[PDB]
Design a protein around this ligand. Structure first.
Ligand code: CA
Length: 302
């Protein structure tokens, strides 16, 4: 402890003098939240909510006009994207109805803590707010077995906006307030769309009820309604990217800060909106694995 504190102090001094450097947090912070990975979480969804079978969802999506036999290339490409994500049956397959919340509860958490206190349960509430798809009242999403991998959702190359509420609970089942915790909003691609629809696909986070901390040099900027996304392509150097997608957009890439922003938690119920334009399939991971360089973990005194 007394040596981790030394080290953490020295790392904050270093984050301060390098804060204007690429990859560094523009305002130095330490991490007190540990919500990094929970591969063996127990996932529970109320029996109220239909969890689709693979072929059952496939037939539903086809009945919506999104099928391989639609002569409209944009529709059939939306199908092959949907089909790909529909092939993993470890996800819970959900049909969101506009304005109707869906809770996804993960218990049996083995790795997570905040400032020394064990996190034993995380609850996600998903509510479709808007889609450019069909009558605008429905969208597919896929809840991960792992709460830190979190979700895929679709837009079928239109647009989707889904509100997410997140609540963390300790071993006593009491609501926890993760104020000061850092969350990783990562992999917010712009310009990585399908060349058959439009290259300027956009992934964003909107309406975050916490405070963003810009990563220096990152393509992800703050906009109105507390929203974070890139202002131009972060996918192709020929459209002005620093790095092509493949050179930064992985969980271990040393350049992954390029598509990320940090979120500082301010409330016990965390809230943001996942929103996409022209993406087809969208991965949205919610966790504490900060992409910024040199963010120290805050040690806890026994
Ligand atoms: Ca992404």
């Amino acid at each position: 402890y007394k040596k981790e504190f030394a080290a953490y102090t020295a790392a904050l001094a270093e984050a301060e003098s390098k804060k204007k450097q690429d990859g560094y947090l523009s305002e130095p912070r330490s991490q007190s939240l540990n919500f990094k990975s929970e591969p063996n979480a127990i996932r529970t969804i109320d029996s109220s909510v239909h969890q689709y079978g693979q072929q059952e969802l496939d037939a539903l999506v086809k009945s919506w006009g999104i099928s391989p036999t639609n002569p409209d290339r944009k529709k059939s490409r939306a199908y092959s994207y949907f089909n790909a994500i529909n092939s993993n049956n470890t996800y819970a397959k959900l049909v969101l109805e506009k304005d109707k919340p869906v809770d996804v509860t993960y218990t049996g958490l083995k790795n997570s803590s905040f400032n020394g206190k064990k996190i034993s349960k995380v609850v996600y509430t998903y509510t479709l707010k808007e889609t450019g798809f069909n009558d605008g009242t429905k969208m597919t999403m896929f809840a991960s077995s792992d709460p830190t991998v979190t979700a895929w959702y679709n837009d079928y190359f239109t647009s989707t906006n889904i509100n997410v509420k997140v609540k963390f609970y300790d071993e006593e089942g009491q609501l926890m307030n993760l104020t000061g915790g850092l969350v990783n909003f990562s992999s917010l691609n712009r310009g990585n769309g399908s060349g058959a629809i439009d290259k300027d696909a956009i992934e964003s986070v909107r309406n975050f009820n916490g405070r963003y901390i810009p990563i220096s040099g990152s393509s992800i900027k703050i906009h109105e309604n507390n929203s974070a996304y890139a202002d131009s392509s972060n996918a192709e150097k020929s459209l002005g990217a620093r790095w092509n997608t493949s050179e930064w957009d992985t969980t271990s890439s040393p350049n992954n800060w390029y598509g990320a922003i940090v979120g500082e938690i301010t409330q016990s119920e965390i809230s943001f909106n996942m929103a996409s334009s022209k993406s087809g399939n969208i991965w949205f991971a919610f966790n504490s694995n900060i992409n910024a360089i040199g963010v120290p973990t805050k040690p806890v005194a026994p």
